[model samples]
Target: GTSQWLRKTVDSAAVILFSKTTCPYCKKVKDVLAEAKIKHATIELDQLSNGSAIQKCLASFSKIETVPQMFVRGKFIGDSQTVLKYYSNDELAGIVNESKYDYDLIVIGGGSGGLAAGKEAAKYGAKTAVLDYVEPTPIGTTWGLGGTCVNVGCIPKKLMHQAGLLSHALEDAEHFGWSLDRSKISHNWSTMVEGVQSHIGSLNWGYKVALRDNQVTYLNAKGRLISPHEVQITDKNQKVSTITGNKIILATGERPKYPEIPGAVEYGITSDDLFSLPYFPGKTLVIGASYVALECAGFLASLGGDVTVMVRSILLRGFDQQMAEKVGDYMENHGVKFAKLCVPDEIKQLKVVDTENNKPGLLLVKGHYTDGKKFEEEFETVIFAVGREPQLSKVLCETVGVKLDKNGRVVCTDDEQTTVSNVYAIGDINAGKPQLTPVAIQAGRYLARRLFAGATELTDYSNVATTVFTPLEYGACGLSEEDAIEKYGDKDIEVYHSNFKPLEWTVAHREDNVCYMKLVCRKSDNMRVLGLHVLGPNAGEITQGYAVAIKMGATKADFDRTIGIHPTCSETFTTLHVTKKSGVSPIV
Candidate 1:
């Protein structure tokens, strides 16, 4: 069933042609290879069709799902157009040579870590190419180029959410007898949103230009592996091409998911999809319980939209239950209405009452609730906070014969390598915890250095951290109580937590808000800090310092012995008293 050549290592640097006499692109690539005085041997597809054994050999050798695929050093690069560009006026050969420096490195997405890796690769004299979908992604949407971080995910959401909070502050200031102009106190939703888009647009352009200036061949299209060292690039036109190197990195990012409900696709939009809506709707419905759903609801509600949220169960199920409950209460207090424990069953469009107005209204309904209560509400828009999966369809892992989890995510070893050597995937595409943008970016950079840069870099994401931007800022690192129980057993671990008012809010005499912090540790080293979680003002900012400590192998004693800044809520860290039988004790 197999032949010897199928198992042989095809040195991608040696021969560059896999062309038949009939195909024009194949002929063009071969002629250029000859013209450039590059030595190569050709494989005629017509000849390979003589036997199924040869067909299997061709499939194994060229991992591309489609043909006219060419290679360098026996590696699949792409089709003839890409080959011509490589052999002729294009700088393709130079790029390949650079990517194979003393240390080989590649970065997938061109967001934060992707940009950092591109710069790092150039610093190391490695030929690097950063692949990012241009404006709106290759799916023909107007999404930004810098993946989730610079685009619709963190940076924009944080800014918009902050605007909401600031606007709230102006209204709340009246409670202190600070009389302000209510007429002038208004936020232009369009203006705020446009500002976010402008900033992201600038970053995307800046990233692309930086790569070009640094000599990184930045391709704006979808990239998937045809082989361990090769990638198939699909442009907007559905025209397919290929790229090959000694190694490949997958930095392809993720998109928001919508629940599978009848007519959901017709009536609903994911969080990312709302970026392009012409106008902010008067009534909006968001479905989900986490930061994504809550943030959208809060922002829209603050912007004067009547907003409702549908959480499948409890809000923020992965966080400490106490903190989640607190955050949910605060959200409701701020004007977001909660529809608890009911999932979206169906979406239906409302009849346009007036023929003049172009905007359409719609109704969203939930399936089952304890009281059989159904939520019937009309909204100009509905946003889904449903979770996301990696957009790894371009990866074509099945064609390459690489293993994937049932979730269709690429499988990597402890070292982040796929079954095929030299190819790796990280970020949302790799199966793991915390689908945070920062986590994904770190994984990309770590893998590049560990596997390619000859540096002894290893990533232990066991205690990775994350942040949630809500009315109450929240941050978490390592494991939640649930995760700790699943890993170390419910009896083997203990949780240390606190709830109180911060000095700033206390000074303002705000009684409605509260802060929370928790540390989950092991029973054996009950005082040893295995995880740190916080939900309060500056949670992300404060958690960074804690995460750094944890990453540096800090122990419970280290935290206990360290002195905290004066007059800060974080000072509680140095005051924690640990007990093996009961964990951290109650405050005296």
Candidate 2:
């Protein structure tokens, strides 16, 4: 009720004021609007019932607690000082221009999320536009239409991961009755990259074609909110322009983070550059234990490069610790090395050659283990898989008066609406939500429906499926075992797990490599399945089908009754009966 009332109140008038009769600052705002010949609406906090509640809401809403707060066309315009500053700039008259904005909706980002929202809004007959721009990485790696997923993150990552899988498959080909010349078998890094870029480039063009087909304006420009509704756009040619929108949605996803070490950005590369690398990465050092770090190192090793991972902390911060360790262990036996509990202190450039993405340039990496033991290594490439931060860095959050969470992501509600009445955010830029493409695209599409197509259903984020593309793929839906224990208590939790080798790996005589599957259910709730995790080949495909069952509140009995395919790896999930608390004969 507070959200609705506040929104309507702010939108009721072009010029709105929240103040107290006893407050001196209120008089200044009133006189200024009066001087500008603008009619306004005023809410006296000292007089109305639940008026104090409204002020409290305003305090958290805009981070401006004081009275005499001003709103222009549903946008927070700040307090008396802010309004006066506008007066001095002689821009107060523009505030009265309440004319129609250039577009009804302006979506910032070309990623799946932003594109979905833009096209959906356009379908509803709303004047809409999608403004997207990609900033080149520190190593001069740049791309077209799609966001991180298509250009650098998901799609490309998956292709490279597939390459690694094929390479492993080639190793096992002899056992499968395919006579092969082992010496003639090899992977060409540049050829794989060329194919990856070609596929990515086609997808980029398809996006623009869809936008044009749907009657939505698409601009290849970076957008910054100069005001709540006004965006300053800068194109590739350094030309600047401005566009106004009645509603703005931010879906600008995140980019890989770079350490501030002296030579990090100068000599180090990130996942962004790895995808489209024109040259092969020789002996490489991958920093951080994040999934990005492990995946890159795993694939590179399969490609026949000397790859090592440097870990400063535990792998996969939010993942189940036990499962994470298994992934790292699997990698260790597969030729990927780890320098655990280590951090890079500095990266020095030993030599520079123009490969564009800067591969094959000699780099000297210096860092110390947590135990204070110093170590240095020489490599042709240094990749910092440290982490990522939202692209909100360039956005004018302060000027726009939008509230962001401490992590710098736009704080949103159940409806994906931001604190600003006319603004919303989705995808990776949205705080506390899954940063996956499907998640964002779903949110973006549903958001457009609610705003225009008379829909009221909200996006459900619970138990969304996720997969990690490590050498041994890991897929999960719902909570981890540790999270289940924390939520339902160790006594109330039942974990059924088993270790089984894939049928394919068996024929290849790889009995040492085994796959794992587990289900975490709450005993107090009729053994309702709370978590489903599987680690093996085709884990993504396996987790996806189970995700539907989990979302529908499937109980352990449902899984028990389901028939398993004769020899499929996913059948491991359907047949699990071992309980951790049962003290069953050893997990291995």
* Candidate 2: tens digits of C-alpha lDDT, residues 165-241: 88878879988899895568888999999999999999999998998888789999999988889999998899999
lDDT per residue as tens, model 1, 400-488: 76677888777888767777777766767777645766666677666555432333366677777777788777787776677777887
Runs of candidate 2 with Cα error greater than 4 angstroms are: 1-99, 354-359, 391-393, 586-588
TM-score of each: 0.76, 0.83
Worst 10 residues of 1 by lDDT: 7-16
Task: Estimate the lDDT of model 2.
Answer: 0.84
Clashes of each: 17, 0
